[PDB]
Design a protein around this ligand. Structure first.
Ligand SMILES: O=Cc1c[nH]c2ccccc12
Ligand SMILES: O=Cc1c[nH]c2ccccc12
Ligand SMILES: [Cl-]
Ligand SMILES: [Zn+2]
Ligand SMILES: [Zn+2]
Ligand SMILES: [Zn+2]
Ligand SMILES: [Zn+2]
Ligand SMILES: [Zn+2]
Lengths: 160, 160
């Protein structure tokens, strides 16, 4: 990465995850595969949901291979096996779940099906229900506060 | 931009600003020069404040030239003159002020000196005090919710 690329990537990685180092492309890949597995869970993941996930991943400034490989990835592997590919991703259980919630929300408000999926995955991930409930709440609050931001900045027309 | 670059830049621009189109590099530049002018306002802008601003801007996937030029930019121009350089940035007064608040907070909690500056710039921007107070409150909420997220995701160890 260029120094300017590293500036943007470090900032955004720190912004969303609190990290003081940019994850390896390999780790970004494994993390996103986990997220997609989690969001898809039993069922399917819609194009819109997958597109949001890929866009989120691209924003971190990952190498192109990571996105091209996610595009063709069939998230049909066992979630516990995926996370075990990396010691770093294997610390990321709550982080993965939260991103999976946001991905699932991308194509509309969470249905009971999607709430059921997330809990099935949280069980696989070893996350207690109280924590799952807190992560869902955090999602709703984050989504609501973003909407509040946008409506305050641009109540009428937006330039772009 | 490549399709993958557009993917990530679109995503992050929509995420922070609600925009459906990536701004031109010139508009990103003019916006950020306005933010830096606002943050500096009366007085001075610390290296840490400026670094946060540059990293924020770089995270949108702007061309390198934008960042290189912001590095040497002396934010000594009149705020209303900078914003008038773009019809898009001329709609962005509240957006600029919120980013300026975040920039000011990057090197520590807002002092009454910074709060005084913000209001001086808001007057130049034509923003009413009630709205200034709302933007500052939004900043506090956003910063607190982010801390909450990070403590919930990684209460003990973090992978990166
Ligand atoms: O790469 C992005 C990312 C976000 N959270 C985690 C956690 C562990 C490895 C990588 C990542
Ligand atoms: O370029 C980033 C940006 C964020 N808000 C606005 C508003 C107007 C022009 C550009 C921008
Ligand atoms: Cl998010
Ligand atoms: Zn969904
Ligand atoms: Zn939709
Ligand atoms: Zn250059
Ligand atoms: Zn400050
Ligand atoms: Zn007031």
């Amino acid at each position: 990465m260029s120094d300017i690329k590293k500036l943007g990537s470090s900032w955004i990685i720190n912004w969303f995850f609190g990290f003081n180092q940019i994850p390896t492309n390999e780790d970004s890949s494994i993390y996103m595969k986990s997220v997609l597995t989690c969001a898809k869970a039993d069922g399917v993941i819609s194009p819109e949901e997958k597109d949001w996930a890929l866009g989120f991943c691209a924003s971190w400034g990952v190498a192109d291979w990571v996105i091209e490989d996610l595009k063709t990835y069939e998230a049909d592997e066992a979630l516990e096996e995926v996370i075990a590919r990396s010691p770093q991703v294997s610390m990321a259980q709550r982080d993965i779940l939260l991103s999976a919630i946001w991905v699932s929300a991308a194509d509309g408000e969470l249905h009971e099906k999607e709430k059921a999926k997330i809990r099935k995955m949280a069980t696989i991930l070893g996350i207690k229900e109280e924590i799952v409930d807190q992560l869902e709440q955090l999602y709703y609050y984050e989504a609501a506060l973003r909407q509040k931001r946008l409506n305050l900045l641009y109540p009428q027309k937006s330039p772009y």
